[PDB]
Design a protein around this motif. Sequence first.
Motif, PDB file in Angstrom:
ATOM      1  N   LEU A  57       0.836  -1.314   0.051  1.00 41.17           N
ATOM      2  CA  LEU A  57      -0.019   0.098  -0.061  1.00 41.17           C
ATOM      3  C   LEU A  57       0.864   1.175  -0.132  1.00 41.17           C
ATOM      4  N   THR A  58       1.168   1.552  -1.019  1.00 47.03           N
ATOM      5  CA  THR A  58       1.776   3.063  -1.395  1.00 47.03           C
ATOM      6  C   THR A  58       0.922   4.153  -1.994  1.00 47.03           C
ATOM      7  N   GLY A  59       1.257   5.400  -2.035  1.00 47.23           N
ATOM      8  CA  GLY A  59       0.703   6.378  -2.546  1.00 47.23           C
ATOM      9  C   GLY A  59      -0.515   6.722  -1.914  1.00 47.23           C
ATOM     10  N   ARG A  60      -1.126   6.199  -0.815  1.00 47.86           N
ATOM     11  CA  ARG A  60      -2.037   6.640   0.189  1.00 47.86           C
ATOM     12  C   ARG A  60      -1.565   6.608   1.517  1.00 47.86           C
ATOM     13  N   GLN A  61      -0.815   5.787   2.157  1.00 52.31           N
ATOM     14  CA  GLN A  61      -0.204   6.134   3.269  1.00 52.31           C
ATOM     15  C   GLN A  61       1.118   5.447   3.328  1.00 52.31           C
ATOM     16  N   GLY A  62       1.788   5.533   4.589  1.00 56.58           N
ATOM     17  CA  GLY A  62       2.989   4.771   4.730  1.00 56.58           C
ATOM     18  C   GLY A  62       2.655   3.331   4.651  1.00 56.58           C
ATOM     19  N   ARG A  63       3.891   2.596   4.574  1.00 62.08           N
ATOM     20  CA  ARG A  63       3.881   1.117   4.357  1.00 62.08           C
ATOM     21  C   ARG A  63       3.311   0.257   5.736  1.00 62.08           C
ATOM     22  N   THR A  64       2.575  -0.329   5.421  1.00 64.35           N
ATOM     23  CA  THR A  64       1.929  -1.062   6.481  1.00 64.35           C
ATOM     24  C   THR A  64       2.449  -2.611   6.492  1.00 64.35           C
ATOM     25  N   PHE A  65       2.202  -3.746   7.380  1.00 59.94           N
ATOM     26  CA  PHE A  65       3.109  -4.972   7.016  1.00 59.94           C
ATOM     27  C   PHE A  65       1.811  -5.865   7.652  1.00 59.94           C
ATOM     28  N   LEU A  66       1.896  -7.135   7.081  1.00 59.74           N
ATOM     29  CA  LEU A  66       0.772  -8.676   7.564  1.00 59.74           C
ATOM     30  C   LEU A  66       1.882  -9.465   7.884  1.00 59.74           C
ATOM     31  N   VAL A  67       1.581  -9.900   9.216  1.00 56.83           N
ATOM     32  CA  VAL A  67       2.400 -10.995   9.731  1.00 56.83           C
ATOM     33  C   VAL A  67       1.672 -12.367   9.129  1.00 56.83           C
ATOM     34  N   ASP A  68       2.442 -13.247   9.416  1.00 50.13           N
ATOM     35  CA  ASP A  68       2.239 -14.745   8.846  1.00 50.13           C
ATOM     36  C   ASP A  68       1.054 -15.099   9.931  1.00 50.13           C
ATOM     37  N   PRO A  69      -0.029 -15.821   9.534  1.00 57.19           N
ATOM     38  CA  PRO A  69      -1.090 -16.373  10.231  1.00 57.19           C
ATOM     39  C   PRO A  69      -0.680 -17.283  11.402  1.00 57.19           C
ATOM     40  N   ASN A  70       0.541 -17.980  11.205  1.00 55.86           N
ATOM     41  CA  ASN A  70       1.019 -18.762  12.332  1.00 55.86           C
ATOM     42  C   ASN A  70       1.836 -18.118  13.004  1.00 55.86           C
ATOM     43  N   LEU A  71       1.390 -17.546  14.434  1.00 60.02           N
ATOM     44  CA  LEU A  71       2.054 -16.841  15.203  1.00 60.02           C
ATOM     45  C   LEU A  71       1.439 -16.488  16.536  1.00 60.02           C
ATOM     46  N   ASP A  72       2.115 -16.702  17.454  1.00 58.51           N
ATOM     47  CA  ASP A  72       1.420 -16.441  18.851  1.00 58.51           C
ATOM     48  C   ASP A  72       0.718 -15.391  19.199  1.00 58.51           C
ATOM     49  N   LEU A  73      -0.353 -15.629  20.079  1.00 59.18           N
ATOM     50  CA  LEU A  73      -1.285 -14.281  20.097  1.00 59.18           C
ATOM     51  C   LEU A  73      -0.484 -13.122  20.658  1.00 59.18           C
ATOM     52  N   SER A  74       0.256 -13.299  21.880  1.00 62.84           N
ATOM     53  CA  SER A  74       0.927 -12.377  22.343  1.00 62.84           C
ATOM     54  C   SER A  74       1.920 -11.735  21.654  1.00 62.84           C
ATOM     55  CB  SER A  74       1.620 -12.926  23.820  1.00 62.84           C
TER      56      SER A  74
END
Length: 581
Positions: A57-74
């Motif tokens: 997502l560029t040209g609308r706001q700064g770069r965001t990220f998505l983590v992998d779905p296999n990750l501890d909740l905390s």
Amino acid sequence: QQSLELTRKMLRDKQSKKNSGVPIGSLPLASQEAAVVEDLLYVLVGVDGRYISAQPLTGRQGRTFLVDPNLDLSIRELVSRILPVAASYSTVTRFIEEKSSFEYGQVNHALAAAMRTLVKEYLVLVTQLEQLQRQGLLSLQKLWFYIQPAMRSLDILASLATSVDKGECIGGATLSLLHDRSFSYTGDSQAQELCLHLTKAASTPYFEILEKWIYRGIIDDPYSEFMVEEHELRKEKIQEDYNDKYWDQRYTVVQRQIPSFLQKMAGKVLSTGKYLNVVRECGHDVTCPVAKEVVYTLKERAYVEQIEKAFSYASKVLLDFLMGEKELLAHLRSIKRYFLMDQGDFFVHFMDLTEEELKKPVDDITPTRLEALLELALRMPTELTLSGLEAFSFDYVVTWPLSLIINRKALTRYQMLFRHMFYCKHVERQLCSVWISNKWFAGAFTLRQRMLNFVQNIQSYMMFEVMEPTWHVLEQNLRSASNIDDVLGHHASFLDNCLKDCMLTNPELLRVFSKLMSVCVMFTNCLQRFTQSMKLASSFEATITKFDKNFSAHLLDLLARLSIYSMASVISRLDERLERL
């Protein structure tokens, strides 16, 4: 996308203006934390982590990220809370990239580079982190502890960048943001330190611009996007022409791009640089009253005092120049000689000669004779201009420095008052000439004596009352003043006051005294007719009676107009009859 369009637009604006320029969840918690630590270390520089994908997502706001779905909740929560570092860094990267183009002006340019330097130290911290990571001594708790200050700082800087971008701020508008954000984050050194740094950095080029404009008296803008003073038409005669008002932003000041911490001083500063402008234009070397660098004062105003001192210097220099070359006192003396009628010996033969042609239509006469007599002399809106103005009956010229002070409108007002006096005086000495006689039944001596006394009193009272004190007070005001703009105000006030006085003490009289003098001159002409004829008398006395009736009617009307409202001080002199009806 947006950045390219913006920079293209503002480059075009500059060109137009300045004409140039295994599953992680299967992993033990410690291993998962280490992996995510390395991934976030990558993310700090904007490169992906092994288990996080940057959202494109560029040209609308700064770069965001998505983590992998296999990750501890905390751990996923912690990474969510810590992510804004990444987006704030993408934002600052985009900001520094966009300020690359010179079209943002130096001020905006020097802005981003400053943050660029801050970016440097930011990366330094990251290196520290990776060193600790090299030591294997890093825990997510301590990572967050370290970043929290960095988190806040990056948030502050991202907000500043976003504000500048959304407002498209350039120049003082950016500085206005700096002025505002400085106060926007009162109560914390965290933001105040950066605000002071950025204010200093951005103001330095604009401080230099203002210093060149004032100390040197000249704008030197490569790009004109700040408050600035930029307008260049200069019509004719360096903005003189014949009728002149050319101080109305001879160089245009824009209030949209003002830093909005000098506005109280701005009215002083504009004139401050204008003065030097025009003393360069009249031709004179310009020097700095005092050479010093001016900085932003977050707690004081040393620039306000500096500008005040420079303004005083400039004003005194300009006053000396005007009282030097093209002295206004010389102009006043010249106006008093003839325009304000300090020489009637000329006037006598002017009058002997002029009515040989004033009885005739213009362009059917000899203008030359006018000046032939003038050189002799030295030997010894439409209701705001009236319809009784003559095409021309006077001539005088000013010079470039003198034109800087006296406008054409003042000359027209002087000419109108001089025409009024000319009328009065010629009527007066018509009566004086016809008066001469020696040694009964013709009569009418009282009528002529009455009209003569009336017109004499009108002339004397009006001229004394209006010109003497008004002129003297104008002299005193000018001698007491040094502000050239204040000088012009003094002259304008004196001229307007004399306008509110004199023949146009009532602009809706309306020239009833003109009707009085017209009937008076008709009486004088008929009297001369009859005297020349006799050199019937019943008709002569009947005409005398008729003219006395007309004179009395006009006199009563004018007395009523004065008594209603103007001023009866002339009526005070008046008390034909000492008394009223």
